[PDB]
Amino acid sequence: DKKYSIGLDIGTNSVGWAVITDEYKVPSKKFKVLGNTDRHSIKKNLIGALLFDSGETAEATRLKRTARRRYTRRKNRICYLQEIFSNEMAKVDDSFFHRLEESFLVEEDKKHERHPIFGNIVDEVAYHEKYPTIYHLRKKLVDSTDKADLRLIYLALAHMIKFRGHFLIEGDLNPDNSDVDKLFIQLVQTYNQLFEENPINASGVDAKAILSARLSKSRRLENLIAQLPGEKKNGLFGNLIALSLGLTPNFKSNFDLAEDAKLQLSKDTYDDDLDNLLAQIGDQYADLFLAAKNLSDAILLSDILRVNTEITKAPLSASMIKRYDEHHQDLTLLKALVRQQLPEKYKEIFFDQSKNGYAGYIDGGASQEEFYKFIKPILEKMDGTEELLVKLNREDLLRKQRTFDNGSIPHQIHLGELHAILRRQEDFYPFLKDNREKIEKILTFRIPYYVGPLARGNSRFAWMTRKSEETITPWNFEEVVDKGASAQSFIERMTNFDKNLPNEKVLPKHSLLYEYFTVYNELTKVKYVTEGMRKPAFLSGEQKKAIVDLLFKTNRKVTVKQLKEDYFKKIECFDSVEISGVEDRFNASLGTYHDLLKIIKDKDFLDNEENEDILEDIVLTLTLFEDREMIEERLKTYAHLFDDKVMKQLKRRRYTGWGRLSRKLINGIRDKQSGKTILDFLKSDGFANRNFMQLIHDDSLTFKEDIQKAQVSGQGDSLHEHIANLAGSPAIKKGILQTVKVVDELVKVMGRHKPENIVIEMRQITKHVAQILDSRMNTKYDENDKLIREVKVITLKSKLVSDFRKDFQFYKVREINNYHHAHDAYLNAVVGTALIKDFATVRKVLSMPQVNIVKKTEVQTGGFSKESILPKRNSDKLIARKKDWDPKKYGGFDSPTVAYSVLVVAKVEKGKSKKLKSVKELLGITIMERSSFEKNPIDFLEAKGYKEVKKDLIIKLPKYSLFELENGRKRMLASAGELQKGNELALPSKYVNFLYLASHYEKLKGSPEDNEQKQLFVEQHKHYLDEIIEQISEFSKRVILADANLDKVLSAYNKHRDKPIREQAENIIHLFTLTNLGAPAAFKYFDTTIDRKRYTSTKEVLDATLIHQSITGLYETRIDLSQLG
DNA sequence: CGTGATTCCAGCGTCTCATCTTTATGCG
DNA sequence: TGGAATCACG
RNA sequence: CGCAUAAAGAUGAGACGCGUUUUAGAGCUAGAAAUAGCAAGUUAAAAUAAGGCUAGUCCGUUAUCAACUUGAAAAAGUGGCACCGAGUCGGUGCUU
């Protein structure tokens, strides 16, 4: 026996393999064709390739899951709301909540009256004429004092709870008929009364247009600055204006504050940053800040609410009512216009649902835009359309109320209207007086993103911790869930664990200990030369200890520029020392130390080392959390040793980022005979210049033994490391997993012998790739705890072979057949083994008709079907959306996805007079029906009208099951009613070489003589252009069997048979979408298209052979299905 | 009533909080 | 790119 | 492998606006019909994978998968070799 080297190819859609010996030949062997066929053996060369569908990223599933959760919780909102007054709706009419549920149903499926709001036509019709939209009811309820109808209250409230707005504005709002202009003038006056040196003036500034245009907020700010008389963008009044339109200014440069003091209006931190300013600068600007807040509120409220109504405290509902009135008038006008003039267009606009006009726009499913692309022609051709052309130019003509731009409404004004309804109907409905807060909470309560799914343990996504087993409602959430541990989990479950101690976690990025560690390790490298010494020397440990106290504990920043003059010549008085190292920069500095020095009362609480346990817990909470409620709750257990002012100072700070080392690694483990930690050794460098980067593997310390031992203690599973891999960026790790599978398989098809010089191929991921090969094998140990190097693993930078393919002309015309994956793998092996090591062998491996191509079978999973809910039809293709929703009435989905097909031989009644007959048929199991089938297949097939099913004769047929019929014709099973081309065209290499040069694949390249030779090669061999068509035609006739398309292609080929060769090649290379493996795909040849010839028949394969193939396709179970019937 | 062609179709768009990774250069 | 429908006929 | 800076992918969570579907929002007129004339149109309820039991304000579209023996599963196990060729793999021989 002889060694072997595998050439492998990672990828996102396929993985190639090959097996090469000491010389580049590819061995050959027979192989056992197990199964019931006269063909016992089939010779195969080891070179093949495994095509597969690309692994999908979990984004689509996550989106679906979040949507499902949101629908569940919206239904709960409505249920929460219905049971809040389920006992008073019973008084008026009990079936009211009943009718709404079955409002979807048809007359013969309902069990109540067919009117959902009132239960009677007259009452029903009066509703849609008094309230042509919900917003007339929303408008009415805000502005009314007469007794409403509890079902009409539910209607409005349910309307807002169901569609409640966005939560991006933190805080609260109140429209209360506020006007922008007066607020701006009031701000100007407030600034002027304390800035008489240079007061602001309104001359030349539009107080309303500038800050309400469609321009971006910063652009509007700078435009306002420009329109002002002489103000600068960074002035105090400029900052106030910027706040007044939502920008985030900082005031240290204006009020000479002790801190930067940002005012982040768009975040909840504003509510206390304003208080901080009221502490730092005081009341001198309180009214100015409040005016700026009011201006920000008004500007943001108007930016989305285009109207400026005053008579009503319901700006949104009144807005949409106005949009309804304008749409009605606009339509009434446009109707007369297109019938006083242009009288031939009426039926197409107001009746035809197939055209994007009004008929389409309203009833048929056209959008606003497609209609606006349609009605403008007809508006351009008639007088009196000026008002209509104006609106179309602004997207304001004939507008809907429920639209794609309605997403800018905050939940705050929905909430305002909900309080208005609540605040005006309580006296008439007393139960409503003591339910005010409960409903508002239903509208306003969002689960925090750091609590996550509210599971009790059956959820792989959840982390919430419960103080009690009670059910979580809006009103007991604050007390059932322990928000603090919930948030700490939210961060910690995602925070890494320290590699040196794989079982436990890293510390914050600004830990006090980590803060020292990062700097103690840096200044170790400082060098100096002075009198008396005979050669350069570093700093000593005691010198570092002394330096820390009077350089790093003292100032916010440290540089050798200070040290080389302030320390040596003055602290220990070196005469003429010369200092070496980095010229100026010290990267690490005790940033947290000076922050605390500024924040907390005493420096002694930082110079002291006994307070270490506290500071680490303080910084830990300032990094884990970001809510003020949570930080306030957590710090307070430790503020009792500080003054309340110090506690308030700490509460503001936030850190970000997590470290890569653990507290125990730095200060937990101690040498078993030296009794010192890594931190201690960083204080005790000594003469050896020892530091962490060598302490972790210096055998004179036990730290090496501990770290190595821990990396073993944390193990326990092997096959799951292939899914950690690159922590996150692809979902193509499918490639890695399949790759190992073909190395595994190839071993047990090479005599369980391991390879030598395994050459991977495609710096980003390949580092992870190679070692998992080195980990899954090459594992035997040695006496000194050393792994023996039994297999060598290579990796290349994805490009070296692609230059070898030109340097030696082994051209790669991609579009012909998939043999290039295996051929690239084989050249990968060639180059890899050459780099570490006859020429002709390549010429054989590059013209071998046989290449083990396997399309990995697959059991389809995912969406049950296409997601569009199509209208009601009289077909059996439609799928009920519920157990009681017959599709013929209700519509449903269609075009399912079949997980896999099953072969069934069974009896079925047949004939005009029913009698039994034997049959053989492919069923096709949908993704829905897979669970029922795998529960018990006999009953499942038996309910489908089949009788007398034989279990042992049932066969599972995943997608891409490969059959073979006459003349080596093969077909792949694309969902039980469609085959799919199953053969490859071995268009020999002589026609590959000509076509690559001829079509000049990239654009055009080559040196003068090289270009001359290559172009003349195409000129001389013009008759390959006549033989290529012969290969395509004969192969199509033998396997593709597309008579019409082959006729078309030949006819077109002759019809355009006179263009220059380059143009001829560039289009014939598109003729290989005929002979390619896989789904048929239409192509064009010189602006004449040969469409796609589908197959749409699985009858042929029933009486054909079936090839179960392994991962590599070297082992077959080749069932002949004529034996079954 | 069993074959075979041509045509058409497919759910989409926002905000926010956190958390890993790799790429590119400059030092050890 | 696979399901479904509309169309021509032997 | 750690430090200094910028951008791009992956994971999770919390939320919005739509869209589709059946129904509800008594169409009138010439008629015996087809069909024609007129009027209206902008909103809502419900569902948004069937559904599952663990019965949660949870789970349900990612990953994984040839066949065969043992199987509750996990998982293990199952298919000699060489030399001369080439059209999807064929031939010859030692072996058994």
Curated annotation (Swiss-Prot):
Chain positions recorded as Mn(2+) 1 binding sites? D9, E761
Record region (RuvC-II): 717-762
Q: Where is this region: RuvC-I?
A: 1-61
Look up what happens after changing R1094A: Dramatically reduced target DNA binding, slightly decreased target cleavage
- Enzyme Commission identifier(s): 3.1.-.-
> Position of motif PAM substrate-binding?
1092-1094
Q: Which UniProt keywords apply?
A: Antiviral defense, DNA-binding, Endonuclease, Exonuclease, Hydrolase, Magnesium, Manganese, Metal-binding, Nuclease, RNA-binding
Q: Note down the stretches annotated as region PAM-interacting domain (PI).
A: 858-1125
The entry's active site is D9
Q: Which PROSITE patterns match?
A: HNH_CAS9
UniProt keyword RNA-binding present: yes
Q: What is the effect of changing R69A?
A: No DNA cleavage
Q: Coiled coil located at which positions? A: none
Q: Null mutant: what phenotype?
A: Loss of correct processing of pre-crRNA and tracrRNA. Loss of immunity against a plasmid with homology to CRISPR spacer sequences.
Cofactor requirement: Mg(2+)
Q: How is it used?
A: Coexpression of Cas9 with an artificial single guide RNA (sgRNA) which fuses the crRNA with the tracrRNA in human cells has shown it is possible to target and modify DNA sequences of interest. Cas9 plus the 2 sgRNAs have also been expressed individually in human and mouse cells to achieve DNA targeting; cleavage efficiencies of the artificial sgRNA were lower that those for systems with the 2 sgRNAs expressed separately. Microinjection of Cas9-encoding mRNA and a synthetic sgRNA into zebrafish embryos induces targeted mutations.
Can the keyword Manganese be found in this entry's annotation? yes
The record's annotation in InterPro entries points to:
Cas9, Cas9-BH, Cas9_PI, Cas9_REC, Cas9_RuvC, HNH_CAS9, HNH_nuc, RNaseH_sf
Region: Recognition lobe, residue numbers: 55-717
**Impact noted for substituting R73A:** Significantly decreased DNA cleavage
The record describes how the cofactor is bound as: Endonuclease activity on target dsDNA requires Mg(2+). The RuvC-like nuclease domain should have 2 divalent cations, while the HNH domain should have 1. Crystals are often soaked in MgCl(2) or MnCl(2+).
Q: What does this protein do?
A: CRISPR (clustered regularly interspaced short palindromic repeat) is an adaptive immune system that provides protection against mobile genetic elements (viruses, transposable elements and conjugative plasmids). CRISPR clusters contain spacers, sequences complementary to antecedent mobile elements, and target invading nucleic acids. CRISPR clusters are transcribed and processed into CRISPR RNA (crRNA). In type II CRISPR systems correct processing of pre-crRNA requires a trans-encoded small RNA (tracrRNA), endogenous ribonuclease 3 (rnc) and this protein.
Per UniProt, subunit arrangement is: Monomer. Binds crRNA and tracrRNA.
The name this protein carries in UniProt is: CRISPR-associated endonuclease Cas9/Csn1
Q: Which organism is this entry from?
A: Streptococcus pyogenes serotype M1
